[PDB]
Antibody, heavy 225, light 220 residues
Framework: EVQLVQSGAEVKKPGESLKISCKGS????????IGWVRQMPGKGLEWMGI????????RYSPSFQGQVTISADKSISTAYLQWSSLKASDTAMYYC????????????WGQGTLVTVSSASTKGPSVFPLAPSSKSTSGGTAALGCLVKDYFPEPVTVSWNSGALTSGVHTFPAVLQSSGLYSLSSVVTVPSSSLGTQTYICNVNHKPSNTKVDKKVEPKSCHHH | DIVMTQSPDSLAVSLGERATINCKSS????????????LAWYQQKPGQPPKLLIY???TRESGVPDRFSGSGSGTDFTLTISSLQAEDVAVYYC?????????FGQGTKVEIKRTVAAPSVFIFPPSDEQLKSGTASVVCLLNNFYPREAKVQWKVDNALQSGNSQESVTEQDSKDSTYSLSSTLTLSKADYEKHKVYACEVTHQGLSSPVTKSFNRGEC
């Protein structure tokens, strides 16, 4: 099938250069236009430009002309988007896509490359348990979780029991605290019975700081019953 | 330049009902001599890239379910989901490709209207581990509720709190069409240790009266 695979998330300082990539497979790379779309945080879709890898014919939006370079290397089926000098305002998600033509819809899209530009310090999170309550519950349902506090920039990923626990999980959108650092909680509801028999571990990854934490969340035993 | 305007910005309809989104172009996108409307529709789910649904205004893309269709001509276009499913919650965009630069609509958020569901409410004291670091976050969880509208009030020794909490809400669940919400009270270890009773009071239409979850500092 047609697959468009983009390079990983980038964290850079203003003024740094950056080239991101998009590798196309499962079709004739030199036979289709390929291009780029910007999505600002919380915003819509902006067309950036396209290139025909057959001959490197490259067309830009007037908004993006002179601001980025779009290129392609047909020998390795890869399209690129690059900035010589990054600004904080370039912080956005960038999508590559296959186009039907210059005057065309976008039929296949890459997974997106998150680009974060900031002079602020990269920081890994601290991870704290949200232990399940000792008080008797209503319908045999306990909630527990992990608080993932004080990290920059986004994102963190959270899993439970290495991916083995998926049901009942809510990992909340991060909130920006006044410290300029993000915080988020990940919770799960589980059967009350399982608390003594089942181990719960949240697996937190923060790729930008190369931080990985596995935090066990256990009940507190404070009574002889 | 061609400007694409979608209407409405948000709409909410019940499972299995008809959902209609409008898109209007500032100039015609019908290429008269070949009779094509140069218009496409996309679906974007949170955390995912857009997906092509419709092209040429009314041609459904391969692999897209029967329930999706587009119509209209010239400057007036519609996307119709004939029987909305829980998984169809998403932002939908229209796109013109009649003239360069290619331009998109601002998107319409589609949401499922479902039966009212009261939140299950949980409060979590700060961990011993965090308290050692010198900070106390108290977390109130509102789980699996509908509709979105909810109020969370923190009280500390029965005193209303203001300006020291932040909340976050999940996207509507793709299976059960509910929301969950966290509200986090952050204070210093010292300010935390200045009070004895911590309480989250939750107002939601699925509840007859505001529901309070509380704990005494230190208790387990």
């Amino acid at each position: 099938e047609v697959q468009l695979v983009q390079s990983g998330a980038e964290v850079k300082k203003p003024g740094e250069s950056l080239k991101i990539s998009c590798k196309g497979s499962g079709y004739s790379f030199t036979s289709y236009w390929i291009g780029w779309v910007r999505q600002m945080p919380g915003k819509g879709l902006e067309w950036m430009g396209i290139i025909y890898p057959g001959d490197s014919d490259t067309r830009y939006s007037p908004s993006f002309q002179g601001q980025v370079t779009i290129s392609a290397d047909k020998s390795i089926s890869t399209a690129y988007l690059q900035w010589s000098s990054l600004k904080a305002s370039d912080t956005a998600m960038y999508y590559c896509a296959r186009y039907d033509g210059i005057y065309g819809e976008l039929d296949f899209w890459g997974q997106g490359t998150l680009v974060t530009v900031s002079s602020a310090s990269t920081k890994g999170p601290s991870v704290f348990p949200l232990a399940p309550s000792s008080k008797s519950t209503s319908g045999g349902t306990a909630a527990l979780g992990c608080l993932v506090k004080d990290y920059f920039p986004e994102p963190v990923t959270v899993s439970w029991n290495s991916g083995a626990l998926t049901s009942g999980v809510h990992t909340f959108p991060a909130v920006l605290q006044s410290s300029g650092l993000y915080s988020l909680s990940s919770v799960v509801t589980v059967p009350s019975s399982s608390l003594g028999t089942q181990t719960y571990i949240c697996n937190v990854n923060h790729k930008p700081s190369n931080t990985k934490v596995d935090k066990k969340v256990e009940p507190k035993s404070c009574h002889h019953h | 330049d061609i400007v694409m305007t979608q209407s409405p910005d948000s709409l909410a309809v019940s499972l299995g009902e008809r959902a209609t989104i409008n898109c209007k172009s500032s100039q015609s996108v019908l290429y008269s001599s070949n009779n094509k409307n140069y218009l496409a529709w996309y679906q974007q789910k949170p955390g995912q890239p857009p997906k092509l649904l419709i092209y040429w205004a009314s041609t459904r893309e391969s692999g897209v379910p029967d329930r999706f269709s587009g119509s209209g001509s010239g400057t007036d276009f519609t996307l119709t989901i004939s029987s909305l499913q829980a998984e169809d919650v998403a932002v939908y965009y229209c796109q013109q490709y009649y003239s360069t630069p290619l331009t998109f609509g601002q998107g319409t958020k589609v949401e499922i209207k479902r039966t009212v569901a009261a939140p299950s409410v949980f409060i979590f004291p700060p961990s011993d581990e965090q308290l050692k670091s010198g900070t106390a976050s108290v977390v109130c969880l509102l789980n699996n509720f509908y509709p979105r509208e909810a109020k969370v009030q923190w009280k500390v020794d029965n005193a209303l709190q203001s300006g020291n909490s932040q909340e976050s809400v999940t996207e509507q669940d793709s299976k059960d069409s509910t929301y969950s919400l966290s509200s986090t009270l952050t204070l210093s270890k010292a300010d935390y240790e200045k009070h004895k009773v911590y309480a989250c009071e939750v107002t939601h239409q699925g509840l007859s009266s505001p529901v309070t979850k509380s704990f005494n500092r230190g208790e387990c």
